[PDB]
Subunit: 209 residues, 6 copies
């Protein structure tokens, strides 16, 4: 079997408000996938995070404190997934990697939010995939993949170039490259059938050495 | 100089989306008040809390996990106030009473969200006030004060300008303030003031007893 | 099998000093019950807690600090049970619900004391039973049940009335009602044979919708 | 102005049940002393600790779990002192040395219980004193001072008014103070005073060297 | 009075073994500076970090565990500085920004090691400066300042006395300072000074702009 | 099977720099031994710790802070072993006993460093062996055993005498005595084949009642 880390974008889980249908589905699918593989999840902030961050900006708070606000929101979102995962999820929002590790040992799905200023949840999932020696890293974002056109197959090296030229955070790309983490970038559409997405059946981007 | 704990209702702070105008304004008022007094604050969850809690209910989560989600939302809300209080605020959402005590020692304003399942921020505010031996508990909520019945519904609802903890317990059990918060106010005899956001526009007058809200004390 | 939360009153475990015979017995019984069911325990403060609380009262400490003292004592008592439970108990006094949850996963009996000012251990066990989605909540107190006369069967709604009219804390009753937690209230006598108490064989009160 | 660490024996604080009179009195003395000096405190377990530890022994618990139970009892005891120190006390039982340092920065009295299995509160007090670079360690225990033998038993026991760490080590190894605490006092050369509760009635005189106890220093 | 964050490179602090002379000297300089300003410090890992990280690589440990090992070494290093700062230092290695804020409130110098995998102490220093709204970030490293290329290798490397965050980003991406640290400096516009240990001999002059290093600001 | 606590001296793991060959070997052996027994490890500070401690001494830091520095170094060393133990070790350096206990339950080798000022890692391993009710305590130091001559068999009582007359810390000896923990003291040479060292085949000292 495989150890997989799923990075679910905030805008996808919370486009405006929480997308209940999508949460119901992604939760069910994650459960099925965990029947055969070891699963771990990291959730983003989305619209809600940007609203609270914007409020802090009006009070001219530091950029660091804004990140801390964005982080607290992501943990709020993660709780919605943990709820949706029922008895299969780890009860608390995992805040560090070894904790996610403990959940895996207990056969429970750990759900993380952000962890530190300066990063995005993409960076968290990448570092999580690297810490867990995960076999696969699935990034579900707001776009079909890595684009004028769409690149289907590429390597970490090629990924750092595009990032330097949205989609995926630079720190996340550095981590995916330094470790050579097989990563898959798909949109909300392919995420409607994860079970097959991990089988290579998807219309996204596959980044691997 | 007094020690005052402010209990700011979540629906006043976040009616739908965060009410930036009220946050800015109440932050200015708290700052003014803190010039002469020791100030501590507790904020509720509001509309955002109810949205996230309802989503959890749709997945049949336990009421305990729902409370935990509400607590998590109150802390995000608390961060908005901290941002508004600027350099006068204790930098981090305070999670326990002795930490709030600490912020006060440092001449900073601690801002708390929730703490434990089963309670509301109102209970948190009362326990905080009790712990700090505050001189006053000011509850800023979605109503003018304490009425004989729900003022937003019952036409016969009349405002009770003054009352003792015992009476508040009766009216509550029969809710502006919940039971636990009411029991804490009664067990310690905490002087409590219940006002709406109109009176909240001028906290220095509210503190002096110049308001149209309700005053509860032994 | 069942997931059961046992709420052992402080006065029962510590009437004056620790009742060693009762601790020996309740510990053994809890062990047997855990052979077939998932067990979790919450212990009260009793006489000792009231003595230390009274000392703080003489120094006019706040009501909140008094609760904190009562809480530290309950954790002291819980350690006596953990000791009595030997290799079957979780080594540390559980301080929060998800920790009790972890112990259950490890097949170990978690023993909690109090957790927050304003509550009683009854409230803790009720919230614990609700968090663990426990099947049964057993409250072992100083009285035969819920009394001039003794009510054998009743519902949460009926329980909130009596509490408003000792025995069980209001916050605990609110939690038992909002979730509909099947609860059993017995005295020290029935607690001498737990194995059968959970079978419905007892002369106490059964509160359930 | 000096920095002083007070090591209050658990059997003096809780002979059987908590000794309210001694607690009240020692709290007043500590408060007076804190007016001119920086004060920190460590308290032991006493009779309650022995009761709970003996119960654990009856269930064949390891000695490590027994120590942990003792530590837990010392902290409940520490809360009684904190309650007695009122507004002068750091609100929470201090669990590590740097936190005690912090309380001192805030002009408050930190009160510690135990910290780690294997040690006694005496060792905790010595390490605390060493960490804070205290000028003085005052041990208030169940004996008049340090004797050539147990004064409660041996008739030839004679009190040694003054001695050096080395001597205390000899007398201890052969116990008013345990080995580890003694080794810490010797490694750092901490000026230590050992008195009973009679001399504890007036700490300002004790601090000046006016007591009938034992003074240990290099 | 200013608020200054000092980013002391691990290879300057521990070239091979800890450089006691530099530690002693930089501690004296920081102490002098702290007389008039609020000072906070972050230190790197150096040679010891690379040794322990290389050992981990030989056992095929993940890059995340390697970072964690580096962080652990930076904190041991931070303890050497704290020891050097004596009574002016916050007693414990600070692990998060709000704790550093706290040390500053207590008129003490917080010293941080690393915090999270993926970052370097340079990033930590920038985030710290951003969080404290520091007036200045002083990077003391193994080079004279910022050059057009590696001065220890490329012969055409020329020092750029002044530049804007954007330029630093270009030069870095093409490293005195790493990308993340550079992005943080650019997002907030933190006035940053990059000097070697020669200029570090006199921080009061460095602070005034009297140095031969590089100054980065919007 | 047995529950064994291994106390690896700092000078042995770090004579000057980290002895990579020895780490590779001790790690492999610990892994094999854990195939049949429950294993737990405590690592010392060695040369590196003495260097950092000496630096603090030059700045006249307190003896307590020096211990804290020595402690942080030991945790640095423990991370090298955890790395060398790969997927068989507990991911984080265990800082307290019940945490080591949790690792055991998860079938993972917990690696501790120091824990509190005033102690040595020998004291930590002894208290750990006592907390875990370990069957055996193996102390790997810089000397062949307990010496002019070498005592092969002895009792805790006899061990406290020699310590009062290096090798093993007094607090560690008190703990080994008060609990009667069967202890084996060997040098770096015997530690080259742990699997047999625990079988009684070694040229060291066996301290037991």
């Amino acid at each position: 079997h495989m150890r997989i880390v799923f990075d679910i974008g905030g805008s996808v889980l919370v486009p405006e408000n929480p997308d209940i249908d999508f949460i119901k589905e992604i939760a069910y699918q994650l459960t099925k996938v965990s029947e055969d593989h070891e699963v771990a999840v990291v959730v983003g902030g989305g619209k809600l995070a940007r609203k609270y961050i914007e409020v802090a900006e009006k009070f001219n708070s530091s950029e660091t404190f804004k990140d801390f606000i964005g982080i607290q929101i992501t943990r709020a979102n993660a709780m919605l997934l943990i709820a949706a995962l029922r008895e299969k999820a780890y009860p608390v929002v995992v805040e560090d990697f070894w904790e996610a590790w403990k959940a895996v040992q207990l056969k429970k799905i750990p759900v993380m939010g952000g962890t530190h200023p300066g990063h995005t949840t993409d960076a968290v999932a990448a570092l999580l995939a690297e810490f867990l020696k995960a076999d696969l890293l699935v990034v579900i974002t707001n776009v079909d993949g890595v684009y004028a056109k769409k690149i289907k197959k590429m390597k970490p090296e090629e990924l750092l170039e595009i990032v330097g030229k949205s989609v995926i955070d630079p720190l996340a790309a550095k981590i995916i490259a330094r470790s050579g983490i097989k990563t898959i970038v798909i949109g909300k559409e392919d995420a409607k059938d994860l079970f097959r997405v991990i089988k290579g059946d998807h219309n996204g981007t596959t980044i691997e050495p």
